[PDB]
From Swiss-Prot:
Cited InterPro entries: Globin (IPR000971), Globin-like_sf (IPR009050), Myoglobin (IPR002335)
Family membership noted in the UniProt record: Belongs to the globin family.
Database matches in Pfam families: Globin
Listed name of the protein: Myoglobin
Phosphoserine: residues carrying this PTM: S3
Keyword Acetylation (UniProt): no
Catalytically driven reaction(s): Fe(III)-heme b-[protein] + nitric oxide + H2O = Fe(II)-heme b-[protein] + nitrite + 2 H(+); H2O2 + AH2 = A + 2 H2O
Gene that encodes the chain: MB
Length: 152
C-alpha cells in the first residue's frame, strides 16, 4: 500500500495532468509508440502512423490519450480500493486487446518520463517515488487478474 502522504503526493501531481489531460495523454502515447513500436500494432487505426508528425497531428490519437488518462485518473483517486474499477479493465486488456503486462510497464515508464518532461523540477524525488509506487500497484493488481485468466 501507499501511505496517506504518498497518495497525497500522487493526487497533487495528478492535479497537473488534469489541467491538460489531452496533451499529456497524447505525449504519453507518442513516447510509448516511438520507444516501443510493437505497441502500435495493437491499434488498427494507428498503424497508418509512420512518423512522429503524423502521430502529433492525429486527433484520434489524442482522443485515445484522454480515454487512457481519464480512466487512470479514476483508478488513482480510489487510492487502492480500486478493485471494481480495475477488474473489468484487466479483463478487456487480457481477453480482447491482448495487452501483455510488459506494455503496461512501458506506458508506466512513459507517464513517469512525461511528468518529468512537462514539469521539469516541479515533480520531485518524493512525488516521483509515490507515482512510481501508485503505477506499480495498478500493474500488480492487473497482473493478478491476468494470472487468474492464464494471460501469457
Ligand atoms: C494505464 C494504462 C492504460 C489504461 C488506463 C487503459 C484504459 C483503456 C480504456 C478505458 C479503454 C476503453 C475501454 C476498453 O476496455 O476497451 C482502452 C481501450 C484500448 N486500450 Mn488500454 N491500452 C493500454 C494501456 C491502458 N489502457 C496500453 C499500454 C495498450 C496498447 C499497447 C492499450 C491498448 C488499448 C486498445 C488497442 C484499445 C481499444 C482501442 C480502439 O478503440 O480501437 N484502454
Amino acid at each position: 500500500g501507499l501511505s496517506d502522504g504518498e497518495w497525497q503526493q500522487v493526487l497533487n501531481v495528478w492535479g497537473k495532468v488534469e489541467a491538460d489531460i489531452a496533451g499529456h495523454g497524447q505525449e504519453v502515447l507518442i513516447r510509448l509508440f516511438t520507444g516501443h513500436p510493437e505497441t502500435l500494432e495493437k491499434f488498427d487505426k494507428f498503424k497508418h502512423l509512420k512518423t512522429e508528425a503524423e502521430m502529433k497531428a492525429s486527433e484520434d490519437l489524442k482522443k485515445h490519450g484522454t480515454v487512457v488518462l481519464t480512466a487512470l485518473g479514476g483508478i488513482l483517486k480510489k487510492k487502492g480500493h480500486h478493485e471494481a474499477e480495475l477488474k473489468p479493465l484487466a479483463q478487456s486488456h487480457a481477453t480482447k486487446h491482448k495487452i501483455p503486462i510488459k506494455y503496461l510497464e512501458f506506458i508506466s515508464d512513459a507517464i513517469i518520463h512525461v511528468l518529468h518532461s512537462k514539469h521539469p523540477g516541479d515533480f520531485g524525488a518524493d512525488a516521483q517515488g509515490a507515482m512510481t509506487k501508485a503505477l506499480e500497484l495498478f500493474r500488480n493488481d492487473i497482473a493478478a487478474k491476468y494470472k487468474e485468466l492464464g494471460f501469457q
